[PDB]
Design a protein around this ligand. Sequence first.
Ligand SMILES: CC(=O)N[C@@H](Cc1ccc(OCC(=O)O)c(P(=O)(O)O)c1)C(=O)N[C@@H](C)c1ccc(OCC2CCCCC2)c(C(N)=O)c1
Length: 104
Amino acid sequence: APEPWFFKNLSRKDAERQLLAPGNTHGSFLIRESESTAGSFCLSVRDFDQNQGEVVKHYKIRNLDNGGFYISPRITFPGLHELVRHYTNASDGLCTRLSRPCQT
Ligand SMILES: CC(=O)N[C@@H](Cc1ccc(OCC(=O)O)c(P(=O)(O)O)c1)C(=O)N[C@@H](C)c1ccc(OCC2CCCCC2)c(C(N)=O)c1
């Protein structure tokens, strides 16, 4: 099930541009590999800000010793799919609720 929200090869800059492109809106997101840490991922989400407005925010997805994933140590997940579904249901600390995957 090749997940639409997973962009393997895509830099931090690419993600911001791709997300800010026409067709995407508030809550659009994508998960990419981190540039700082090889083997980890980042969640890039498009949020509506007060000043300039349209901005892209990046969250680090940290790995658990047993194989899980989490953004905040308070809620962990057995995989990326579950992390995406959880934040799609409720922002739960995130800048905004995850909505529709990034469109090209
Ligand atoms: C400059 C910048 O964009 N910083 C990001 C974090 C970040 C992401 C990726 C990379 O490199 C990697 C790359 O490839 O860009 C780096 P870096 O290695 O270049 O420094 C830093 C940020 O502060 N975003 C906010 C929105 C953010 C805000 C709060 C956070 O936790 C608090 C909890 C609160 C409850 C809900 C869950 C979050 C987190 C976070 N966990 O990181 C992130």
